[PDB]
Design a protein around this ligand. Sequence first.
Ligand code: CL
Ligand code: CL
Length: 136
Amino acid sequence: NFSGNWKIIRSENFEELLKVLGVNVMLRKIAVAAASKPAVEIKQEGDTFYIKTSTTVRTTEINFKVGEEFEEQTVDGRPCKSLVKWESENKMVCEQKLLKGEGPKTSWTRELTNDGELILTMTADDVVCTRVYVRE
Ligand SMILES: [Cl-]
Ligand SMILES: [Cl-]
């Protein structure tokens, strides 16, 4: 199950994800370094989740239940309305809809492997970033 404190072990394509969302080079470079050793805390109670992710300069906290819309931010920091569903046993998928304006379609997935790794994917249109974590 997803509860725990998680440390990153792999990251692919993060800078490009930000690039396609229009994030400028200075901010991209700052963000990638800032998130290179994040702190991720998850508390799962059935279908209810608390997820806190902290970088060197940012901290985000979401509280949601699978199947119930909630507000969060896109990876580039725009407010959005999100909805998580279970795709399969321990794989949740989230569609995001901007609160204001338009932009590239964004989504994320979080799944647990049999070996206890957490895989996050984040997509912005046709660009996918994958980050893998393990429990502390
Ligand atoms: Cl990366
Ligand atoms: Cl992260």
